[PDB]
Automatic annotation (TrEMBL):
<dbReference type="InterPro" id="IPR050316">
    <property type="entry name" value="Tyrosinase/Hemocyanin"/>
</dbReference>
<feature type="binding site">
    <location>
        <position position="247"/>
    </location>
    <ligand>
        <name>Cu(2+) 2</name>
    </ligand>
</feature>
<dbReference type="InterPro" id="IPR002227">
    <property type="entry name" value="Tyrosinase_Cu-bd"/>
</dbReference>
<dbReference type="Pfam" id="PF12143">
    <property type="entry name" value="PPO1_KFDV"/>
</dbReference>
<keyword id="KW-0479">Metal-binding</keyword>
<protein>
    <submittedName>
        <fullName>Aurone synthase</fullName>
    </submittedName>
</protein>
<feature type="binding site">
    <location>
        <position position="277"/>
    </location>
    <ligand>
        <name>Cu cation B</name>
    </ligand>
</feature>
<dbReference type="InterPro" id="IPR022740">
    <property type="entry name" value="Polyphenol_oxidase_C"/>
</dbReference>
<feature type="binding site">
    <location>
        <position position="114"/>
    </location>
    <ligand>
        <name>Cu cation A</name>
    </ligand>
</feature>
<feature type="binding site">
    <location>
        <position position="247"/>
    </location>
    <ligand>
        <name>Cu cation B</name>
    </ligand>
</feature>
<feature type="disulfide bond">
    <location>
        <begin position="12"/>
        <end position="32"/>
    </location>
</feature>
<dbReference type="GO" id="GO:0046872">
    <property type="term" value="F:metal ion binding"/>
</dbReference>
<feature type="domain" description="Tyrosinase copper-binding">
    <location>
        <begin position="114"/>
        <end position="131"/>
    </location>
</feature>
<keyword id="KW-1015">Disulfide bond</keyword>
<feature type="disulfide bond">
    <location>
        <begin position="204"/>
        <end position="433"/>
    </location>
</feature>
<dbReference type="InterPro" id="IPR008922">
    <property type="entry name" value="Di-copper_centre_dom_sf"/>
</dbReference>
<dbReference type="GO" id="GO:0046148">
    <property type="term" value="P:pigment biosynthetic process"/>
</dbReference>
């Protein structure tokens, strides 16, 4: 029973999900696509590779092509599926409950590609057509999108090509003014700017990438997201991590729903949105090229046969499947990489905690009455499935912390941090990217006419970094950051997950 997008031209409705303040909304909620009376045809692969370039190291030609392309797209009539507005509505229609699972036999259930394993493949198809449309608008058959390389220090700030004023096609007034001044991106943003040096921000941005691709991105479930079929799946490490941070970091916090980037329904109206996801799409490639155990593609038929519908460069309706976007070579595009051998985030594992900087009585899961609400710092000891595991055992299965049944009002942005075994003496110098930090759970608004979620955290490296591989219990600390005044956690447990081959 795979998720199947219906006739987006026939069955569609106004966006009513993920919008806290529907009144005084800067962008439209009528995200339905144009009706050209088109028949949905099956997808077919292209022929001869599009090289996507770093937005911060683009040449005059590369930048001019992109600017001229967006300008051409902005020039098209709104009724055109290939227009700037129509393309932005695509994200709104799929992320803010524009369609339903009517094709699966459930017209009362909305389709939501986010917070599931449909996250990566959908946005890949989204960019694929969005990329080919722009290329056709400027008569560039080998046109390629840039990508925001925020995993590299010099590429972390927003590229100046997007800055300027309305004369620039890549400009968007609806961005955070405090963040467009050549300032470094915060890949662990929680709604409030941190008072740290630029050196520290870059160092911890690299750590965030390492945390999302290695520490937490241990298996297909933890990386892509939870299983989602027709009829509260886990959110991926990338999706609920660096990805969400950038959206809230760029979005203008003065606007009602943090438009444009700060919300799904309006994100498409900012040109940087597609360039951000261009690098999120690249995380998928890097995640595999690491060639670490567990870093494999999805093989579940329920995922492979899942499909969406898009307008292509020829205004034709095309149905694409997830099974046909695992190989970039077949889609005929890739990313221009640096000559340097390794990636600066490749070894950005948090430093080992000194025992001399560490020092007790905390309730366990049995002694605690669930569900608990995260209106303050919450601590609890969780029984581990094993202790003193050998290098062979830790290389065969991941010890994963599971925070399940996360209930909360998804009318606004929510985030809380997760610390494990934080027994630091009270005179120690702390940093954002400390070893105790397991990561966080962040969610862009996606409410429906209180949402429930689940998080996953790897402990293989963390327990070693905190000198607690021999301890029977692990002290888990949940720290609310924003929108947790009503958040509720239903279950907490640690389990050994075998690494798939
Ligand atoms: Cu999206
Ligand atoms: Cu996004």
């Amino acid at each position: 029973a795979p998720i199947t997008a219906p006739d987006i031209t026939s069955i569609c409705k106004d966006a009513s999900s993920g919008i806290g303040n529907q009144e005084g909304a800067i962008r439209t909620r009528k995200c339905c696509p144009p009706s050209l009376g088109k028949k949905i045809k099956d997808f077919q692969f292209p022929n001869d590779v599009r090289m996507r370039w770093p937005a911060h190291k683009g040449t005059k030609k590369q930048v001019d092509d992109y600017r001229r392309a967006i300008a051409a797209m902005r020039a098209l009539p709104d009724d055109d599926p290939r227009s700037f507005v129509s393309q932005a509505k695509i994200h709104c229609a799929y992320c803010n409950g524009g369609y339903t699972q009517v094709d699966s036999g459930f017209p009362d259930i909305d389709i939501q590609i986010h917070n599931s394993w449909l996250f990566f493949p959908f946005h890949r198809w989204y960019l694929y057509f969005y990329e080919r449309i722009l290329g056709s608008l400027i008569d560039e058959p080998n046109f390629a999108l840039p990508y925001w390389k925020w995993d590299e220090p010099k590429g972390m700030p927003i590229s100046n090509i997007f800055l300027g004023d309305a004369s620039n096609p890549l400009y968007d007034q609806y961005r955070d003014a405090n963040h467009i001044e050549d300032r470094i991106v915060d890949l662990d943003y929680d709604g409030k700017d941190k008072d740290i040096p630029d050196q520290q921000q870059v160092a911890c941005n690299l750590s965030t990438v390492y945390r999302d691709l290695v520490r937490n991105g241990v298996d297909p479930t933890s990386f892509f997201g939870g299983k989602y079929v027709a009829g509260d799946p886990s959110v991926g490490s990338v999706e609920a991590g660096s990805h969400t941070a950038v959206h809230r970091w760029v979005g203008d916090p003065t606007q009602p729903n943090n438009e444009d980037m700060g919300n799904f329904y309006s994100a498409g109206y900012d040109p940087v949105f597609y360039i951000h996801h261009a690098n999120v799409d690249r995380m998928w490639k890097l995640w595999k090229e690491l060639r670490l155990p567990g870093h494999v593609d999805i093989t579940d038929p329920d995922w492979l046969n899942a499909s969406y519908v898009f307008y292509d460069e020829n205004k034709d309706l095309v149905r694409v499947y997830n099974k046909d976007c695992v190989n970039l070579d077949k889609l005929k595009y890739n990313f221009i990489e640096n000559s340097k051998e390794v990636f600066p985030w490749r070894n950005s594992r948090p430093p080992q905690r000194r025992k001399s900087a560490q020092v007790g009585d905390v309730k366990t899961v049995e002694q605690t009455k669930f569900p608990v609400r995260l209106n303050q710092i919450f601590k609890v000891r969780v029984k581990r499935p094993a202790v003193n595991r050998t290098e062979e055992e830790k290389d065969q299965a991941n010890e994963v912390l599971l925070i399940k049944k996360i209930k909360y009002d998804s009318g606004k942005f929510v985030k809380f941090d997760v610390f494990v075994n934080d027994k630091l003496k009270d005179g120690v110098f702390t940093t954002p990217c400390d070893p105790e930090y397991a990561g966080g759970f962040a969610q862009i608004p996606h409410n429906d006419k209180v949402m429930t979620s689940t998080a996953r955290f790897g402990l293989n490296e963390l327990l070693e970094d905190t000198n607690t591989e021999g301890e029977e219990y692990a002290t888990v600390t949940l720290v609310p950051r924003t929108g947790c005044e009503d958040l509720t956690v239903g279950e907490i447990k640690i389990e050994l997950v075998p690494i798939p081959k």
